[PDB]
Design a protein around this ligand. Structure first.
Ligand code: NAG
Ligand code: NAG
Ligand code: NAG
Ligand code: NAG
Ligand code: NAG
Ligand code: CA
Ligand code: CA
Ligand code: CA
Lengths: 380, 453, 335, 177
């Protein structure tokens, strides 16, 4: 916050949770905002409070094509309590709690897992870090840190100390030179192959890939585009480079293209701008592919409205996360335990875990109760 | 079923989940700690050792240290920036000498500020490249550096620069190929020193050394004293690159255009509009540009590409070679590559690209009639025994940098810049810095002492 | 001559690489036919898309990218940097023509691309791109049998090799063609052995081995019996390119050719047809045999008014956009 | 016409080609007519709108330089600011044979021509030559250096070191067997 005084701007800082991210399966934006490319095939320690083993976010990046520089993120393995717990979010959406399938939501040991929409999974922990993982159109990861851990972390996302020249500090006490040379010090398994520096732009290969990627990714830097509202805040040049590189290199050009556009939108919305309606004539197959009875939404900024939640509250909705977009039930509707989207009148109040049907007067413990609009009331 | 001390380990007997050959204690994974849900059978060193990664067994206190894709055996030393590290117990112990901060202002407007941030700004007016004249007290600050883009033959795309090195009450204008002096304030001795460092004018102030390639690139190297107390287009030197876009009123912006527009000297000057991407503007140059800029990926710069990240340098080269559509293309490409050349030179490497086909440098020119002192050295001596500095010592010892230097023989051991020649006895410089031959009166004569009377 | 700097695509998806390998890969989409891919900066990128005319395997589009110039040949038309052009189109270093029976794109010091427009397509490359190329045309290192089909030390098969060098469109997912079942037919009547081993290619046996060509001939014989001569024509091209002098194997039944009235179809005629615009062009030529239409020796071609081949003494002259018949004179004020 | 096509180069072109009217080429302008050379220089500097400008201007001026060389003069323009010619390149670690001469020797005692005579004795012309000392008196083009003894050239003109077999060995005589 900056006040206009003394002929200048008097600027103080509100505390800011740091934000790491891995987008396109290759690009990494650290806590110091040192964007760098990583074409590797191993499990890399994405972030770790390298004083202790309190938490350890791991990311498994896997080569996805003929070219050595064709990568996709494939998993996010939050190790915890020194490896005692491991929450592994795969790329299909499957969530493994201690290598066991666990549907969503789940709330235990202060850890809360839930899907704000069909595109994202939120792994909120009390240790300080929050993971927000994207599955649609492909796999991307975002990490938020309570600024208390400033200047303490290690790993790929850098030590979070407001210095871009120290981000490549390795465990040997020197700043590494380039991205891949730095990453190959943080591999999980000694048997992995070292990442290699990539100069050859895949954009130069196919002229049709060229024109496609150009004509679409140029929507970023267009001053009349929906994205212009964030131009005066976030410089879109790295995002445009990401979109170019992805779409040219991606076998599913639309998937990586829309992943890049979603990444730009989500970063800007993290900075506090609500970019909306940017999918004009583009990425609409992600409008349509929604699960039945759900619908798209551009500003999903809370939990998912559920019949159980409106009946008996929910731990889920007590987590603050950047407003992501995706598929959710529309307002005025709720999804029952069956998952289908019905209005409040069609979903039941739940007492002691008992399905108590809507608009139904019942007797319990010398009391008379009613289930009006999914809301439970008791008298006497 | 192995040969060297490392023996086979099989997961059939062990309960599922043990750290197998994949989680082998190794010179790298000894420290991070290995993760694997699937055991794999393979040959693993006996307890108390690790592997070299090639099938050997080595003690944990001799594991080679890896730096920048290289591998170094213990007992090897490396040089990072201005200091030297040595590999011991899988770590680097480095000397603790302070290293000068570096700002780089070159090309069509690329800047690499002190804190390592990089951006591009195409400004046309005078812009404060640095100053101490920003603070709750402006008057305890000393220096100030402004630059602006000169076109050398037209009014079009930039061809050179114009620097204004103020130092307290002095002043030095750098334009058109050499320096000047418009000292207006108190007339003491110079708080600066001037030297011909290869293809650079280098001006020191005992803590602040400015190097100008004489066409369009300025590299400024500051002592660690000025940390956090400077401003302008080289950031505020705070080791915090996110907020280096701090304008005149210190309202950190996410845009380069506003940050550049803030530091214009004269508010009457019009703000620069949106910079335009060169290669898009003139596609018919792009191919040539890439073919010219591809020098950065070729085996000429194979070694340095592992020591210095060359992505943004390549983007700058291609942008500049695309932009210069009004004349002087070789200079644009030459300086775009030479910024990376100096990055390599400072990092650890004496790279010498500069082929007769590619960015040639005439250095026989100052060789008179078969004299062969003047030779092209890719990294010049840290200090020059110049005519102006007969001592041979220097204040801000710059490392090697490209250009050609004279190998002044003992018979003629004085390098004179005002004639560019190795000679026996030097002349004289006055207060303003003009030169005369010995035995000449000055507007006192010139003698072995110099200007005396 | 053009010993090992040639590759080609002919007939039923038959690919001949630089170093002599022949195989069959029945793809149906775009593939990187050749590309400067082991250098700091690419020089050429030639790709083909192979499709069907009813049943005949054809090339439906070629895209040659080279040094900032994009050339897309398809639908009997040529696109230069996105614009249709009328053949021939010539510029510094590049010239594209409807020469002979094909469309030829020659980029000087880079490549020579012949494309009959229906099936065949042949690349000549400079020697300087040795070992720095990769594609269906091979590695251009000179070793045929050891380095093409060994990816990550694993030896692989024509289907695998032709599928590795694949490239989809921006919004296209082309499948991979499945292996074709066993063969039949073979060379029953001996036509492939009668012709290929016949006198016409005697010295061609000393230069280019016909075993793969024999097999391809038999395989095409399994295909339509109006399309068996592609392998023969390709063998003639290869024999010409290795340096040898092929002989006229054609007969009024063996895929006969037709040429204009004064003009004859020859195998291995001089590529530089003497034309009384330059009636002694063929003097010190350096270019191997070329198949096509020609003129009988002694009478040069008439390109001034396109009257066929005329004797050296009866063909017109030209002055300032004017064409002068023989016997005509024109007097300037000074001459 | 180039300058009409690209007027925005035109000014620069003249500034670059004005080298012909300057005191650098004062003397030669009275020995060789330089109207057409200047027109060619300006047209070339105007035309090269796709890259490689200094080469265009350099060669346009160097044609006039050679005309002056052939007429009667040894003119040396080639300033480090203007058309430089890297000739320190072939200097090995301080060895200083390679010097730039504005007018070269009529014939060069090359590796291929050990005799030192020549068939068409050309006059001086720009370029840098090695002052091959008597200790190493043979100029070898394939390596560009002054050397003590030469190797051998086959019929096609390929070069090999002494004692190396040709696809016979190499000796002081040459290729022998
Ligand atoms: C949260 O963490 C604390 C400390 O590990 C633990 O004791 C507690 O059971 C966890 N859950 C809740 C709901 O506090
Ligand atoms: C420096 O500025 C402060 C106000 O910020 C003022 O009180 C002080 O007197 C100034 N000191 C000098 C030496 O100007
Ligand atoms: C080729 O283009 C022509 C028009 O120029 C069109 O009529 C025809 O259908 C196209 N395809 C073929 C195979 O001729
Ligand atoms: C050809 O390429 C291979 C591939 O690495 C290389 O090992 C070999 O040395 C090269 N040889 C030539 C003559 O280019
Ligand atoms: C010039 O040529 C014309 C056309 O043949 C002819 O009629 C005329 O007589 C000629 N002039 C002479 C012969 O002086
Ligand atoms: Ca940091
Ligand atoms: Ca800062
Ligand atoms: Ca091969």
């Amino acid at each position: 916050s900056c006040t206009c005084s003394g002929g200048l701007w008097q600027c103080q800082d509100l505390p800011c949770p740091g934000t790491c991210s891995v987008q396109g399966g290759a690009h990494i934006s650290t806590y110091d905002e040192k964007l760098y490319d990583l074409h590797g095939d191993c499990s890399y320690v994405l972030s770790k409070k390298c004083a202790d083993s309190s938490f350890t976010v791991l990311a498994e990046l896997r080569k996805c094509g003929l070219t050595d520089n064709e990568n996709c993120l494939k998993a996010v393995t939050l190790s915890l309590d020194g490896g005692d717990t491991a929450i592994r979010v795969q790329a299909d959406g499957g969530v493994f709690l201690n290598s066991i399938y666990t549907q969503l939501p789940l709330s235990a040991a202060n850890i809360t897992l839930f899907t704000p929409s069909s595109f994202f999974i939120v792994v909120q922990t009390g240790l300080g870090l929050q993971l927000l993982v994207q599955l649609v159109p492909l796999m991307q990861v975002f990490v938020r840190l309570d600024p208390a851990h400033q200047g303490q972390m290690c790993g790929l996302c850098g030590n979070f100390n407001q210095n871009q020249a120290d981000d490549f500090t390795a465990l040997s006490g020197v700043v590494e030179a380039t991205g891949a040379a730095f990453a190959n010090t943080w591999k999980a398994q000694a048997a992995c192959a070292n990442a290699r520096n990539s100069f050859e732009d895949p954009c130069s290969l196919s002229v049709e890939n060229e024109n496609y990627a150009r004509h679409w990714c140029s929507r970023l830097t267009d001053p009349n585009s929906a994205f212009s509202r964030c131009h005066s805040i976030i410089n879109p040049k790295p995002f445009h480079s990401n979109c170019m590189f992805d779409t040219c290199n991606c076998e599913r050009s639309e998937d990586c293209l829309c992943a890049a556009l979603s990444s730009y939108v989500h970063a800007c919305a993290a900075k506090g701008v609500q970019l909306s309606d940017w999918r004009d004539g583009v990425c609409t197959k992600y409008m349509q592919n929604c699960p039945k009875s759900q619908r798209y939404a551009y500003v999903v900024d809370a939990c998912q409205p559920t019949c159980r939640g409106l009946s008996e509250a929910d731990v889920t909705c007590s987590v603050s996360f950047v407003p992501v977009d995706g598929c959710t039930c529309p307002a005025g509707t709720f999804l029952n335990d069956a998952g289908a989207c019905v209005p409040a009148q069609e979903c039941p109040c739940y007492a002691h875990g008992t399905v108590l049907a809507p608009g139904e007067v019942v007797h319990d413990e010398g009391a008379v109760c009613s289930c009006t609009g999914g809301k439970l009331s008791c008298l006497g | 079923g192995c040969a060297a001390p490392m023996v086979y380990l099989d997961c059939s007997n062990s309960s599922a989940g043990t750290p197998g050959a994949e989680c082998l204690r190794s010179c790298h994974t000894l420290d991070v700690g290995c993760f694997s849900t699937h055991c794999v059978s393979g040959c693993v060193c006996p307890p108390g050792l690790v592997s070299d990664g090639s099938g050997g067994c080595i003690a944990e206190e001799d594991c080679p240290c890896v730096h920048n894709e290289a591998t170094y055996k213990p007992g090897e030393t490396i040089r990072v920036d201005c200091n030297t590290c040595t590999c011991r117990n899988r770590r680097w112990e480095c000397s603790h000498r302070l290293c000068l901060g570096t700002c780089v202002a070159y090309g069509d407007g690329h800047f690499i500020t002190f804190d390592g941030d990089r951006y591009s700004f195409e400004g046309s007016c005078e812009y404060i490249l640095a100053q101490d004249y920003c603070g709750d007290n402006t008057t305890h600050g000393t220096f100030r550096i402004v630059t602006e883009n000169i076109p050398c033959g037209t009014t079009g795309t930039t061809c050179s620069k114009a620097i204004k090195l103020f130092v307290e009450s002095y002043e030095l204008i750098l334009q058109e190929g050499t320096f000047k002096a418009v000292a207006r304030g108190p007339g003491g001795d110079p708080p600066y020193k001037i030297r011909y460092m290869g293809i650079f004018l280098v001006i020191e102030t005992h803590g602040m050394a400015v190097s100008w390639d004489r066409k369009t690139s300025v590299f400024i190297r500051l002592h660690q004293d000025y940390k956090g107390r400077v401003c302008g287009l080289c950031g505020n030197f705070d080791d915090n690159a996110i907020n280096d876009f701090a304008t005149r009123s210190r309202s950190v912006v996410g845009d380069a255009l506003e940050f550049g527009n803030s530091w214009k000297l004269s508010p009457s000057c019009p703000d620069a509009l949106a910079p335009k991407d060169p290669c898009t503007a003139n596609p018919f140059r792009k191919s040539w540009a890439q073919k010219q800029c591809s020098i950065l990926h070729g085996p000429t710069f194979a070694a340095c590409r592992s020591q210095v990240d060359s992505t943004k340098y390549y983007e700058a080269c291609v942008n500049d070679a695309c932009a210069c559509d009004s004349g002087g293309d070789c200079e644009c490409f030459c300086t775009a590559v030479a910024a990376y050349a100096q990055a390599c030179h400072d990092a650890g490497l004496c790279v010498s690209w500069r082929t007769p086909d590619t960015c040639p440098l005439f250095c026989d020119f100052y060789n008179p009639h078969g004299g062969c002192e003047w030779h092209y050295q890719p990294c010049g001596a840290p200090c020059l025994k110049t005519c102006r500095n007969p001592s041979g010592h220097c204040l801000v010892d710059l490392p090697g940098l490209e250009g050609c230097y004279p190998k002044c023989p003992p018979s003629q051991p004085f390098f004179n810049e005002d004639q560019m020649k190795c000679v026996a006895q030097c002349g004289c410089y006055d207060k303003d810095g003009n030169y005369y031959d010995v035995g000449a009166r000055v507007p006192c004569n010139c003698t072995p002492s110099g200007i005396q009377c | 001559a053009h010993n090992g700097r040639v590759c080609s695509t002919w007939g039923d998806f038959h690919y001949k690489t630089f170093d002599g390998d022949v195989f069959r890969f029945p793809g149906l989409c775009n593939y990187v036919f050749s590309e400067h891919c082991r250098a700091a900066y690419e020089d050429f990128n030639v790709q083909l898309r192979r499709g069907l005319v009813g049943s005949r395997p054809v090339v439906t589009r070629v895209v040659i990218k080279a040094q900032g110039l994009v050339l897309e040949a398809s639908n009997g038309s040529v696109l230069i940097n996105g614009q249709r052009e009328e053949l021939p189109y010539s510029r510094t270093g590049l010239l594209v023509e409807q020469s002979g029976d094909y469309i030829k794109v020659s980029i000087r010091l880079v490549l020579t691309f012949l494309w009959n427009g229906e099936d065949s397509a042949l690349l000549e490359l400079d020697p300087k791109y040795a070992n720095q190329t990769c594609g269906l045309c091979g590695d251009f290192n000179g070793l045929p049998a050891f380095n093409e089909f060994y990816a990550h030390n694993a030896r692989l098969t024509p289907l695998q090799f032709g599928n590795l060098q694949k490239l989809d469109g921006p919004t296209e997912q082309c499948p991979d063609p499945l292996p074709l079942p066993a063969g039949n037919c073979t060379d029953e009547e001996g036509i492939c052995h009668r012709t290929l081993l016949g006198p016409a290619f005697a010295e061609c046996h000393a230069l280019v081995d016909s075993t793969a060509y024999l097999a391809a001939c038999a395989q095409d014989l399994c295909r339509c019996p109006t399309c068996p001569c592609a392998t023969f024509v390709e063998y003639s091209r290869q024999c010409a390119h290795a340096g040898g002098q092929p002989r006229n194997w054609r007969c009024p039944e063996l895929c006969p050719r037709t040429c204009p009235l004064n003009m004859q179809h020859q195998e291995c005629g001089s590529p530089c047809t003497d034309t009384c615009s330059n009636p002694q062009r063929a003097q010190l030529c350096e270019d191997h045999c070329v198949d096509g239409c020609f003129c009988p020796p002694g009478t040069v071609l008439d390109d001034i008014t396109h009257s066929g081949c005329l004797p050296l003494g009866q063909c017109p002259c030209t002055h300032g956009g004017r064409t002068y018949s023989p016997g005509t004179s024109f007097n300037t004020t000074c001459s």
